[PDB]
Ligand binder design. Structure first.
Ligand SMILES: [Zn+2]
Length: 172
């Protein structure tokens, strides 16, 4: 049914970019995983690279500009916030939660008080590449102590249990 798209490592439902269009989008570019962005910025090694990263929209908020919480579904505990302003917001703000995106050459922002999460914005709506729906974006199958469903996010293709609940499945 679905293939692991090579650059993101995600199985995509209804892919919007062909394999050749991705090849030319990636040509000559540095792939940097989301989890590496903090360190790259802190050591000022980010700007000199023509770079791309991948993440899925896991949360949206639109207070006019908007923010997307991104996670790449490979390192499950690492998140960035992407801020959409102007043209980018206008073009892209209605995009579905669960969308896989390539993010290219975004600009680091001031830290958002209380969180050590990388915040980035983007010059230009062409630095956002919509790749399709993340078929394996799901919720943890375990329950909390009180019987409520766990709400932690999961990559269904790799593990059906979040970090906290595997810690306990492994001890079984
Ligand atoms: Zn869980």
């Amino acid at each position: 049914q679905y293939h692991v798209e090579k650059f993101s490592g995600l199985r995509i439902r209804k892919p919007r970019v062909s394999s050749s269009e991705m090849e030319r989008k990636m040509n000559g570019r540095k792939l940097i995983r989301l989890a590496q962005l903090q360190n790259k910025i802190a050591t000022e090694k980010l700007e000199e690279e023509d770079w791309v990263t991948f993440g899925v929209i896991v949360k949206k908020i639109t207070p006019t500009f908007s923010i997307w919480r991104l996670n790449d579904l490979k390192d499950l505990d690492k998140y960035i916030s992407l801020f959409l302003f102007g043209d980018v917001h206008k073009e892209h703000w209605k995009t579905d939660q669960g969308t896989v995106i390539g993010l290219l050459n975004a600009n680091p922002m001031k830290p958002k008080e209380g969180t050590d999460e990388v915040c980035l914005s983007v010059d230009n709506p062409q630095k956002v590449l919509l790749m399709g729906d993340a078929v394996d974006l799901g919720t943890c199958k375990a329950r909390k102590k009180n019987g409520d469903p766990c709400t932690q996010m999961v990559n269904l293709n790799d593990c059906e249990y979040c970090q906290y609940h595997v810690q306990a499945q492994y001890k079984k």
